[PDB]
Amino acid sequence: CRAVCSLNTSDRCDFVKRNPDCHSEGGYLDYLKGIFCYFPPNLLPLAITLYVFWLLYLFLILGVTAAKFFCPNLSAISTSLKLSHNVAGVTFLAFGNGAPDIFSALVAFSDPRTAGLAIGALFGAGVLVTTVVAGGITILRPFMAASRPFLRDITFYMVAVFLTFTALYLGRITLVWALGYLGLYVFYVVTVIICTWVYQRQTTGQILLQALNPLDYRKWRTQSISCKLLKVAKLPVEFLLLLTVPVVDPDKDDRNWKRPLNCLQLVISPLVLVLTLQSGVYGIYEIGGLLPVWAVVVIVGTALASVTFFATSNSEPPRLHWLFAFLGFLTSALWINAAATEVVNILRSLGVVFRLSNTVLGLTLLAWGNSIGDAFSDFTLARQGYPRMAFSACFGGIIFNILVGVGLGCLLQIVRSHASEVKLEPDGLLVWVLASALGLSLVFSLVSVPLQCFQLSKAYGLCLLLFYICFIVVVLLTEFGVIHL
């Protein structure tokens, strides 16, 4: 595929249409076809810009679904769990800030050609969240960090980073390695729980229309008009997400019980699940050569919706209300998956056009897109007067991200392909530099925080920011071939 830019403009469409390598196995849109066939060559740059804009919008979706629905379903599950809030919070951070990272890594690992992207998505994020975002917190609100939790988190992160480093050096990932990764993560969770325990011991239709609306005019008037316009674009996407994903909030006395809305959703959610799973391949499968799956799915869904609507009341939620959250969980995750897939495809297309390495795309665009949610949530938490929790999560979430993403992606690739091993092909020297940078950053913290007696100030954040700038300098020099063995 990469030779496409070296051919005449009159043969680009034929080469793209004829080469199997130039076709993506998953997704709804063929971006390369749009670049090289739908648009004239003279408008080639603008189109790319448009793609970037589209890419950014995707990440916005990956934010909202992660924060308002995945987390709400997780919170309802947590209330059923009655888990300790600190234990729930460690689970929540992976559920909230790191879910897009896991789904992007899984989608990238699903195809060997994008495998180099996946690691580039992870380590680069580890470089960013550790250096910029964490540093930003120390700039916004100086505070005193807890000693023992910080030491535990940094030690576990160092162990995970070294394990992935030696795995990359070995050039392969086996099934037992992924199982060990998952075991290490569950060990970390159990250790956190045990340490915390030890430390502690020592009209109705009009109301439905208002619920349907994602925005309030008085709230919009309060909101800055430019902010409101950005919110309005988000609201249409949010309304579409609401039109399909149920949310269960244990903090509400009514548990967000909307009888006719949820009765419609018992039909809507199975339909979108079937039509979106595996890009809808299961959707058009025709049973016995007569009836498609989607028709019988819709029939069963409307029958169940009618039964539930006639079997329940608008005043008292049904005893099986919690099961809704389970559905509100699954579809939500699936939605994120779909979005993740699109992003990966777009990046691959760019790699074809600009002849860029997969690692550069993984550590620059995908990392920023996946960490924008981390940045927003952490800055909001720090500004509101809780810097300790934000800083603790800034290291807690990255360990969960790396371990769960790598382990789950490798496990699913082993199971699906019936292969005994995932081959990691290191894209030249650059990848090593990336790993090196990450380790260095940790060393700085491992010396900087204890030397200040755990009282974090502004200079620490400024130094971390300058470190990230130097890292991007080194990466930019390495990419353009200025330094080369």
Added chain:
Amino acid sequence: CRAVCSLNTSDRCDFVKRNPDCHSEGGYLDYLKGIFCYFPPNLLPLAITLYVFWLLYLFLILGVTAAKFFCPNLSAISTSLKLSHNVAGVTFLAFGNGAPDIFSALVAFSDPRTAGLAIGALFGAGVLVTTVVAGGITILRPFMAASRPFLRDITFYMVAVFLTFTALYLGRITLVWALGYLGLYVFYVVTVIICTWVYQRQTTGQILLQALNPLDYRKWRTQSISCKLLKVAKLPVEFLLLLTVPVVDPDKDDRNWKRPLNCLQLVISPLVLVLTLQSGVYGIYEIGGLLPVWAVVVIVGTALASVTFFATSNSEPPRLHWLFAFLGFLTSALWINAAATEVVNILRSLGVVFRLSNTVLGLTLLAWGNSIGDAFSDFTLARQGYPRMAFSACFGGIIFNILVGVGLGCLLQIVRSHASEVKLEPDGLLVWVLASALGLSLVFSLVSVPLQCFQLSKAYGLCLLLFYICFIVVVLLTEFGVIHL
């Protein structure tokens, strides 16, 4: 010329005397001839050291003429123009920058062989003043920086830097590009004015001999004798300036009216103007084969001086006193020009001897020499209790420097040579690194200042200083060929 160091010592004088390329088109002294003919080879190092000392002294002149006479004439013009003082002060700061940076850039661009020097003079200064000098202010007096002016200045500087970056990548400068540069600068000035308006709305001979002396005995008495000896060397240069350049001070009730001194100056200033313009080429031109220009110039000057002396009184300045400032402007600028030329020539000579690239000389010696005045003025302003003005000027002056210098130099080169374009030949990889460094510095500020809520502290200055040290490390490695594609 560069092969001179590869020849036998017995042929160096002949090669220098015979090669047209080894001769400079402008200046009063042939430095290469002095290095290779006047002095014996065994004293080659000492001579170079002497040159460096001489070079430093030139920059001292470039300081004084910029601060005491160019600015004073501008201040009188500003009172006549009745322009707002803050706008006038930015113009005065630009005039001070122009004497030290615009004139050097113009002289460098006047000759293609030194063209690479000019850009090296600009970007390097942008690296220095932004990193060291600005940082120094934050070390001397922590303060709170204004938000909107800082954002406006940094945005305009980023736009100018990116424009010059793409111009360098294109490898050429056209006439329309220089006109666009000048239009952008005038747009920036108009925008500053409009924003400020919107924000605000929302014996007599013995006395003449005393005036002739440049040092106040009382002030000098307090000053250290070694400092006074340095001041005395400056005072002789100041006396030469007082001797030839008139100064009009609107703050003085008498407007610095010295009737016989100025009557002598009406003869002195035209003579030095004619004898110095274009290295005096117009001076020896002989009219009609009988009379040189300088003789008739002196005759007209003494006639006008006698008329003015007999037509005015020592108590009341004449109605046309302001016109004096105009003269006191022009000659002053011309004086700076002469000094600038010398400096450039010296640097070129060194490039011949040490086989050094033009960019290294531009970003190391010329940048420091041109920015010593910025450093002194900004540190003096910060120490006196006005850090906000100094920090604002630290970014305001650089935009004016880059835009006006590049635009005016390119425009004058197009007009003089009747060529349609100025060719920018990038001296290898190093120049790119220089540009990169500048951009990165801005990014740091663009993240560092807002993250601190515009309250600048000591750590910011220390980090900027360390950044400049790292930049000089990279430049030193690049020059000596340690890193090479």
Added chain:
Amino acid sequence: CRAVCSLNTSDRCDFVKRNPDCHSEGGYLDYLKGIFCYFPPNLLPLAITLYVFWLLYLFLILGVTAAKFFCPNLSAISTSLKLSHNVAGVTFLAFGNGAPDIFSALVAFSDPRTAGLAIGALFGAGVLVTTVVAGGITILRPFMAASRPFLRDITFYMVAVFLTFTALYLGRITLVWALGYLGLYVFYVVTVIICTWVYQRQTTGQILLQALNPLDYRKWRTQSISCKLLKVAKLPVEFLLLLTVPVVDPDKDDRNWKRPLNCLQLVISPLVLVLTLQSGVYGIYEIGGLLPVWAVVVIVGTALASVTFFATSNSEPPRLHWLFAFLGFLTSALWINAAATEVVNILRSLGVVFRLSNTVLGLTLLAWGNSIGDAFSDFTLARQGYPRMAFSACFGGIIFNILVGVGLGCLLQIVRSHASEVKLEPDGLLVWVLASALGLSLVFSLVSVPLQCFQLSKAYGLCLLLFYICFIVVVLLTEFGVIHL
């Protein structure tokens, strides 16, 4: 020697017994012999983990000796003589921290092949001390440094470093150079003394058992389990130190006067000195083959002790009590040095275990082990409340090592080998990289500290720490072939 790893386990011990190039001395135990012959051949790791624990125990010993005996004795010495902090740091702490470095430099200059390794180790130790030790000193306790002594010391250090640079560039050192180094150091000491003088002008049994008891039962009762275990671990070495090293503390009314214990120490400490210095070569030496040195030593010590012994009462401490502190200093310094050597022994075994470039091993392994004592002493002194003295020592001691070690090594090599010169072989570009790093650190300090108004804050140390970490990462990347110079 590394070939013993690939050789059969049965003959490994015999190969070690008859293999050279693995028999470094200066220690007391053959670690490789213990690993490969004693402990069960099939328990390789068992010895390993134990050794790791042993290493940790060593870091405990250096933690105690510096905290309880070295620094209080040195402070008592400084207070008794009314010396300024700068003078004490320049002379006494400098000698105590620089003796092992000088011994290593001599033992390395004994072989002409290892001259480059020795000079590189000296440069690396200088870089580490001037950056990381100073950074920790400034971070742990902010303070205001003396301006004139700091400028003087940094100027002398820069002169010495540039002289070493020139000597390395010439690739040879003659008798004149070594004599000049010695004369320069003597002149530095004389200048220190002269300037300081000019500025100044302008029953017994129960008390013996109680003094030897390191456990305070009242304090013992209230500690936690971990603290109690740590105290139990520290008890034996603390008791041995109490028995060996006298201590004088002017903060107590009795000045820690233990008359019988001090009388016994008057015999114990000199015996330890003679039996330990140069691994007991002087101890085994016989005076005329009839009387060994140790016998005369113990006889004289017992006679002097009985002078003190004749008056049983402790009561009032003698006017010469502060002289004991001098002894309590010297022996204490020895208790540091030996420990540091043992730390290296394990590193040398690690160097034997994993192949490393000899220069690369020398630059980091031979400098961290050499400067671990300096780092411990400086950090302890900074914690106790004397930052000025440690900060001044941070440059005085390094001047001491460079000047005295280089001069003495060159002089001894010239005298012993009867050669007219000592040839320095530059091993690769890593030596020049080390030199450039040292120069950059010195320039950064000289530019930053005066610009900071001599108020050394935490940002200076943090920035230095970042610089050192980045430099170490760059060096490690260069050695492994990632970056080709």
